[PDB]
Design a protein around this ligand. Structure first.
Ligand SMILES: O=c1ccn([C@@H]2O[C@H](COP(=O)(O)OP(=O)(O)O)[C@@H](O)[C@H]2O)c(=O)[nH]1
Ligand SMILES: O=c1ccn([C@@H]2O[C@H](COP(=O)(O)OP(=O)(O)O)[C@@H](O)[C@H]2O)c(=O)[nH]1
Ligand SMILES: O=c1ccn([C@@H]2O[C@H](COP(=O)(O)OP(=O)(O)O)[C@@H](O)[C@H]2O)c(=O)[nH]1
Lengths: 493, 493, 493
C-alpha cells in the first residue's frame, strides 16, 4: 500500500503548468489506487477558499488532499484551547479608544486621537476581510489581518515600512507560529513555533521537522519534489527508508545566458541525483543533455500525464490564431507581436488571441498600440476554461524560447488544433511532425513563422488535416498506461 | 459694492517689498471704499502678535483684515467646545512623573526618570513661550509648543529628528487640524481637518476648499494673487462669477540663467493668463516682453501705488551712500562691495550704509573685512523706519540684477535722494532720467558706477538738484489717481 | 609628604607593558614612602573582580589603590539611599508578564507574549552575570546588564542596533550617571551625573571635575599621565600648585609612515611640555629626537623601574626560540614568521614559541599553516607567568618595528636569556651589546637575523655566556636606586 506526497511551495488559482501537472498526476495515481497528495510550505489565510475554488473548476481532483506546514501547527493550537482569545481582541479594541474617524473610500477609514490628534490606525473593511494598520510616531508599526471578523495574522513593520516579523493566530485567536522576515529580500529567518515552545533556524529547518513528522519512514512512503526550491526540504529529511524523487519541469540551462551556465536550483537537484531515488525529466532529449554534462546516472524520463478530453465539435473556419500561456519573458510574446505585424501586413483579416497574465502583460499591451494592431491582437486575460477558448482558434502558436515539455501546445493538439512553434529545448521537436500535424520553425526565424502562419490560416483543409493528425499523435506517444508504468517501475526497486 | 481678497502665503515683519506693496494697495482700495483684505495659507501661533506689530509700525493699515485658513478652522473648533482640554494637559503632566531635573541655561532644563535613568524630556521656558521635547530611546519623538502656558501645536519627529507630522490645537486645547509633512523637503501632504472630520490631499486641496467657503461667488468678489506659489490655490477654485487676477512682482525670467529659461511659477501664471480675468505686471517693458515670448493677451501693466510721504527737511551734506534691500543674491551687494572699494581707493572720506538682512549678509560681512573697508562700509541691519534712514544719505545706489519695479529706489527718489543704478529689467529705466534725477549705469560696469558715485558724492549742488527732480518725476508718472483708475477698469468689465 | 596619582584610561588583565610599567612604578614609590595610586576613567561593572585578579597574580601590588570616576559617583549614590530600588526590578518584572519562554542554548531563552506573539525579551544567564535584551517592533531597544542578580548598567540601542545611551546603577539599584554615546564612533558625549543633578559636555569635562575633586591642590600632590588619551583630563585641571607630568611610553613618530608625521596624541603632549612640570621619555635617544624636532625643553629621560627577579636554575639546552608580546602590527610577527621559515629550512630541529594575544593573532596562525611550520612554530596564547615561560627558551627574538624601550627584551635579559633583535627606535641599541649579550640585527634584514639565530641556537656555550652578560648589563645600567633618584629630582624643584 504505497502513499505519495508531492512537494510544492504553494498552490493558487492563477498558476501555470507545474500545478496543472501535479493535479493531473494526483488524479492519475488515485485512479491507480495510490493516494497522491500535495504538501505546501507557505502561509495563506484563505487556503480553504482556494482549494474549494480549484476543486469547483475541476482543476484539482476532489480526492487530492493538501497538507500544509502552518495548518498542521494551527491544528495543534486549535485543540490546545477551548475559550476564545478575548484578550487579543480587547488589546486591539483598547488601542482604538478616544478616537475620531475620518472616511476615505468605502471601507477605508483613518482614526485619530480625540485628545491628542495622533494618527492611531487605518482600517479597510471588505465584506469578509478587514485590515487594521496601527501607527507609532506617524509611521506604520503593525497590521492586523482578519478573515470573517477573526484575526489570523499580524505583521510588524520597520522604518522603511517593510515586514520584518509575522505572527499567525489559530481559529480561536491564539498565536501558534511567529517568525522573523528579512525586510530587504523578504526571506524567512528564525521561525518560532509558539505552541510547542520550539525555535527553528528558518523555514527549511521547520519544514524538514514537519515532513519528518508528516511522512512515515516506510518504503511504501514516496516523496516527489516538483518545486525546485522545495528540494532541500525533501533532501534534508532523516528518512532512511522513504523514497525521494525530484521532478525537473524546466530547461535546466540558465535563461538568457550564452556562457553555458545552469539554473542554480536545478544544478543542485541534478548534482545530487545519485544521492536520492531519482531525478525525473520530461523529454528524452533533456535526459541525454543532463547525462552528457554531469557525472550522475539517476536521471529518468517520464512525461506528464495527458488529460485526453474530447475534441471540439467543429473546427474554426475564421482566421483566429491562439496563444494560452503565463505571460513571462521566456514565453517571448514580444516575438509573437513582431510575427503578428508581419502576418497582418500581408493579410488584414487574421486575429490573434493572447490568453493569460504575468510580468510582460503591460509591455506587450503597450507594444500592440505602437505597432497599430489594436484591431488585430487582443489580450484576453487569464482563462479558467482553456479547453473552451481552444474551440475558437484555427491554429495555435509558440514563440517560447525555453521549455520543459510545453503542455499548452500538447493541449491544443489534443483539441484538434495544429501548432506552429520554434524548434527549441525541450518538447516541440518531440510531439510536432513538421508538415504533418504542425510546423516546426527554426528558432527566432520570425519571418518564416509568419509565412507558415499565413499558409495555414488561409487553407482551411490543412488546418483541419493537421489538427486531426495532432490529436492522433498525442494519444499514440503519450498513453496514460505507459507513463504510469514508468513511475511504478521506480517505486518498485 | 466690490470686496477684494489679496492672496499671499504668509505675513511677517522682516518681509520685503511684496508685502509693503500689498499693504499700500490695501490702504488705497479702502480709501476708494473697496475693502481689500489679506488671505494667508500658513500656520503661525503668534499671528495676532505679528498683526499688532505690523499695524503699530504703520506698515499695515488698521482697516485691513487678515483671513487665515488655520484660524478659520481654529474658530470653528473654539465654538465646538466649552470646557478646557484638561485631558491633554494631564497627558503631558503624566509623561513627566517620577522625574529629576537637570539645568542647562536659564529656561533650559532636561528631565530624567528617577527610577530608570531614561532621558524623558527637554523644556525651554521663555516668559510667554515654552517648548517641551519628549524622547523615546534617547531620540526626540515630539515637541509640544506653548504660548502663554497654553499648547497650540505638536510636531512629531522621525529617526533623522525631522518633522513628519503636525497637530494644531484651538484656544481650548482641542486638536482641529493635523497633517503629514514630508520630512525630506518639508512639503505639506495629507491635511486632516479633525473638527469637520474631513481629509484633504494637501494644502492646495485644503485652501481651495477654504477660499470656496470664504469668498462668495459674486461678480463683486475679487481675488488678487500676489504670491506666485499661492496662484494654484486661486486658480483651482470652482468660482464661476468671482474675478481672478494674478500679480507678477518680479522679472519672469529665471535668475542667473543664460539659457533663456523662465521662473517655473511665473511661467504657469503667464501661460494661464487668458483663462483668468488678467495677469498684472509693474512695467510696460515687462508687458511687451511677456507678450512677445508667450501666446497670451490678458497681460496688463499697473504699477505699485506710491506712498508720497513728505521729503526730509535738509539734504545730507556728508559723503554717505545708502542701500535699503533684502540681502539676497539678485540684489548683488557683492558688486556694491567691489564698487565701494573703487570709490574709497579714490576718496577715503565716503561711507556706505547697508540696511537689511538675508541669505548673503554673512558673506558680505566677511567680504568687508578682507577688502579692509570696515571703517567705510557698515551693515546697519534691518530697519523698521526706512524713511528715517533715507534722511541720512547723500545718494542711494542699486547693484540689483533682476527687478520687477524696485520700490526702494522709488522711495529714495520720493525722499529727495538721487539713485545711481544699473540699467536692468525692469524699472530703473522707467523712473530714472540719467543726468537729470539720477544715473543709469550700464549693467555690471562697476568702474563707471564708482566714477558716477564719486561725481555725485563730492558735488553737493548736483546731489540736491537731482534729488529734487527725482521727487518731481515720481509724483508726475506714478499718480495714485491714475493707478487706481487702471484697477477699476479691470474690475468693471 | 608627597602623594602620586597615575592616570590611565583603564586597567585590565590581558594588558601590555604600560600597565606592567605603572604597577612596578607604584610598588617602587610605595617602597620610597610615596603612595602612588592609579586613576581610571572608564566604566566596568566587575572592576573589584579585576583588581582581585591583578593582585593575586602579583602583577599589581596589594598597597596600590585604584581610584575610578564612576566608582566615586556610585559611592556618592550608595550613601544617598537606604532602601533598595525595588521599583526598577518591578519595572523589568512587569515587562515580562504574559510571556512564554523558548530555549536556545543553556542560559539562552527568548520570551514571547502569550496573548499577542510579540518577541518580548532575550535572556542569557551565566552563573553571576545575566543580560536582558528588551525589544520593540522586533528590534532591540535596551539591555539590562546584571552581576550577582543585581542590575548595574542599562544600554539603549538605535535602529542599527548600536548603543547610543548608557545608565549606571549603584549597589542599591539607583541610577547615578547616564550618558549619550555617539553610535557611529562610540564616543562619549553628554554625561549627566544624576546624583548631583549636574550635566557635563563629555567624559573630558566629567573627569576634569573629578580630578579637581579627588586631588588636593598641594605642591605635595603629583599627577603622572601614562595614557596619552588621558593627557587632556590632567592638562585641563584648574590645579595651580599640583605637579603635572606626562610619560611617553612609545615612539612619538606615526607608525608605518614615511611622511615624517607624528602620533596625534604624543605631538600634543610634546608641544605642551613647557606648560607642565615635564614630559618623560624612556630612552636618552628619544629625548634628543624630540628636542631636535620641537621647540620645547621640558623633556626628561627616566627609564622604567626593572623588577630584577631571580634568574632560572638552568639554561635551556633544547633549540627553543621565544617571543612574549602583544600580538599587534608594530611587533611585526609576520617578519618573525618569515625568519622562522629561513631558520627551519636550514635546521629542522628548532622550535618557536609565541606567547600573547591580539589583532594579528589569526593572520599569523593562518600564515603558519601556509608556510608548513605547524610542527615548528606554536602560538602559546597569553601568559600570566612570563617569568616561567622564559625558563623554557634558549634565546628570545624581537622583530618589533617601533618601541618606547621594550620591557619584554629587558625581562628576557634579566632571566639570563640573550636577545636577537632589529636595531630600531627606541631601546634595543641602549641595552643590547652586539656579540656580547645579544645580537643587534639591521632593521628588516630577515636573512641575517635568521643566520644569527642559527648561530646562537646551535652553540650552547654562547647562548649561556650571552645570557649571563645580559643579566649583568641590566643590573648595571637600570639600577632602581638611580631611576628613583631621577624622579625625586623632578618632584623637588
Ligand atoms: O489562460 C490560461 C489558463 C490556463 N493555463 C494553463 O497553464 C498551463 C501552461 O503549461 P506550459 O506547459 O506551457 O508551462 P508553463 O506556462 O508553466 O511554463 C496549461 O495547462 C494551460 O491550460 C494558462 O497558462 N493560461
Ligand atoms: O531695512 C529695510 C526696511 C524696509 N524694507 C522695505 O522693503 C522694500 C523693498 O522693495 P523692493 O522694490 O526693492 O523689492 P524686494 O526687496 O522685495 O525685491 C521697501 O519698501 C523697503 O522700504 C527693506 O527692504 N529693508
Ligand atoms: O604573554 C604575555 C604575558 C605578559 N606580557 C607582558 O607585557 C609586557 C610587554 O612589554 P613591552 O615593553 O614589549 O611593551 P608593549 O607590548 O606594551 O608595547 C611585558 O612586561 C610582558 O611580560 C605580555 O606581553 N605577554
Amino acid at each position: 500500500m504505497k502513499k505519495i506526497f508531492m512537494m510544492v511551495h504553494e498552490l493558487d488559482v492563477n498558476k501555470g503548468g507545474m500545478t496543472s501537472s501535479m493535479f493531473n498526476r494526483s488524479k492519475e495515481f488515485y485512479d491507480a489506487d495510490i493516494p497522491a497528495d500535495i504538501v505546501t510550505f507557505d502561509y495563506k489565510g484563505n487556503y480553504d477558499e482556494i482549494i474549494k475554488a480549484l476543486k469547483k473548476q475541476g482543476k484539482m481532483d476532489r480526492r487530492t488532499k493538501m497538507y500544509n506546514v502552518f495548518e498542521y501547527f494551527k491544528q495543534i493550537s486549535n485543540n490546545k484551547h477551548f475559550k476564545s482569545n478575548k484578550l487579543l481582541y480587547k488589546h486591539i479594541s483598547e488601542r482604538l479608544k478616544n478616537t475620531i474617524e475620518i472616511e476615505e473610500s468605502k471601507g477605508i477609514s483613518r482614526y485619530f486621537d480625540i485628545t491628542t490628534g495622533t494618527y492611531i490606525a487605518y482600517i479597510r473593511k471588505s465584506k469578509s476581510e478587514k485590515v487594521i494598520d496601527f501607527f507609532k510616531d506617524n509611521k506604520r508599526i503593525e497590521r492586523f489581518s482578519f478573515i470573517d471578523n477573526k484575526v489570523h495574522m499580524k505583521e510588524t513593520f520597520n522604518v522603511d515600512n517593510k515586514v520584518c516579523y509575522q505572527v499567525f493566530y489559530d481559529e480561536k485567536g491564539y498565536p501558534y507560529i511567529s517568525r522573523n522576515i528579512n525586510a530587504n529580500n523578504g526571506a524567512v529567518g528564525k521561525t518560532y513555533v509558539l505552541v510547542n515552545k520550539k525555535e527553528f533556524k528558518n523555514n527549511l529547518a521547520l519544514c524538514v521537522y514537519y515532513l519528518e513528522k508528516l511522512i512515515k519512514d516506510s518504503k511504501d512512503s514516496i516523496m516527489i519534489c516538483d518545486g525546485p526550491g522545495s528540494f532541500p526540504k525533501m533532501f534534508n529529511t532523516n528518512h532512511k527508508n522513504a523514497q525521494k524523487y525530484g521532478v525537473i519541469h524546466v530547461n535546466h540551462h540558465e535563461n538568457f545566458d550564452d556562457t553555458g551556465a545552469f539554473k542554480k536550483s536545478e544544478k543542485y537537484i541534478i548534482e545530487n541525483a545519485n544521492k536520492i531515488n531519482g531525478v525525473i525529466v520530461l523529454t528524452e532529449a533533456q535526459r541525454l543533455d543532463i547525462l552528457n554534462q554531469f557525472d550522475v546516472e539517476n536521471i529518468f524520463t517520464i512525461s506528464n500525464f495527458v488529460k485526453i478530453h474530447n475534441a471540439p465539435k467543429h473546427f474554426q473556419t475564421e482566421k483566429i490564431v491562439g496563444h494560452i500561456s503565463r505571460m513571462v519573458p521566456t514565453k517571448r510574446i514580444d516575438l509573437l507581436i513582431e510575427v503578428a505585424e508581419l502576418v497582418v501586413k500581408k493579410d488584414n483579416a487574421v486575429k490573434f488571441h493572447i490568453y493569460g497574465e504575468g510580468s510582460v502583460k503591460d509591455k506587450i499591451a503597450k507594444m500592440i498600440e505602437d505597432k497599430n494592431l489594436e484591431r488585430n491582437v487582443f489580450l484576453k486575460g487569464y482563462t479558467t476554461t482553456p479547453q473552451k477558448c481552444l474551440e475558437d482558434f484555427k491554429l495555435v502558436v509558440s514563440t517560447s524560447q525555453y521549455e520543459g515539455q510545453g503542455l499548452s501546445m500538447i493541449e491544443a493538439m489534443i483539441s484538434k488544433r495544429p501548432v506552429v512553434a520554434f524548434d527549441i529545448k525541450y518538447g516541440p521537436s518531440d510531439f510536432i511532425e513538421d508538415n504533418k500535424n504542425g510546423y516546426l520553425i527554426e528558432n527566432h526565424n520570425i519571418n518564416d513563422m509568419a509565412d507558415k502562419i499565413l499558409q495555414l490560416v488561409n487553407n482551411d483543409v490543412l488546418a483541419a488535416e493537421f489538427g486531426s493528425k495532432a490529436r492522433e499523435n498525442i494519444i499514440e506517444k503519450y498513453s496514460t498506461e505507459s507513463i504510469l508504468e514508468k513511475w511504478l517501475n521506480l517505486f518498485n526497486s
